[PDB]
């Protein structure tokens, strides 16, 4: 912990500066340091943690997919051998991606999930756990690929059970969870029908709850319902 020397409040203030600077590596290191102070995270602080690591791992996933595509093209029939460089560099990026996923899963495990009592915090962390097991699953090819997928499904399912009992169908974390769990069904678990069914059901129940919302809550929820509808338009 190179952040163990900095004040929790200064770590949070600098995570926000780093976001405005688009310095997501710094933002994640700052939020990592804030979590390691051992206090629970506020709603705003959870978003900073999530936003920071999503941008870091998003840059790595984009790079992994470009290199994996170049590597597959060089394994065609009539492809000209170019040596091990494509595979070595795809392995390097992949190893770096797995380290970020393991760092995040380590923070949720020590000890964010076990101290998260409120529905909103616990559903948020269990979603994050499903998401980062999902990113590991995107690059997994060995024996543990099945175990990684089940680790993602298991965390997603527990978040879904809580969010169904404890949150309205329009709650943005509940809709974001359903969006992501749906995509997991589609492209990780080979369950495109389950993916479509969850997205349609999530969209319909939120639509029926919109009348209870203020104009700002209504804008938050409708934004996420539009992402559900876009996925459904793409898959049907």
């Amino acid at each position: 912990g190179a952040m163990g020397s900095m004040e929790r409040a200064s770590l949070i203030q600098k995570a926000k500066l780093a976001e405005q600077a688009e310095r997501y590596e710094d933002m994640a290191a700052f939020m990592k340091g804030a979590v390691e102070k051992g206090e629970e995270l506020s709603c705003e602080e959870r978003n900073l943690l999530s936003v920071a690591y999503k941008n870091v791992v998003g840059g790595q996933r984009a790079a992994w997919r470009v290199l994996s595509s170049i590597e597959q093209k060089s394994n065609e029939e009539g492809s000209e051998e170019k040596g091990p460089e494509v595979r070595e560099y795809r392995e390097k990026v992949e190893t770096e991606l797995q380290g970020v996923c393991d760092t995040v899963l380590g923070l949720l495990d020590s000890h964010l999930i076990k101290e998260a009592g409120d529905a909103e915090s616990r559903v948020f962390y269990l979603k994050m756990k499903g998401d980062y097991y999902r990113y590991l699953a995107e690059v997994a090819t060995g024996d543990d690929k099945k175990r990684i997928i089940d680790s993602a499904r298991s965390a997603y399912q527990e978040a879904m059970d809580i969010s169904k009992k404890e949150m309205p169908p329009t709650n943005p974390i509940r809709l974001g969870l359903a969006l992501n769990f749906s995509v997991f069904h589609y492209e990780i678990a080979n369950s495109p029908e389950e993916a479509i069914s969850l997205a349609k059901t999530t969209f319909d129940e939120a639509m029926a709850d919109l009348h209870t919302l203020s104009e700002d809550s209504y804008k938050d929820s409708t934004l996420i319902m539009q992402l559900l509808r876009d996925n459904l338009t793409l898959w049907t």
């Binding site: 688009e22 936003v51 974001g176 969006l179 992501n180 995509v183 996420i224 876009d230």
Partner: peptide
């Protein structure tokens, strides 16, 4: 057009 997940990159 990539399917959507949340949160999205900057």
């Amino acid at each position: 057009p990539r399917r959507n997940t949340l949160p999205a990159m900057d």
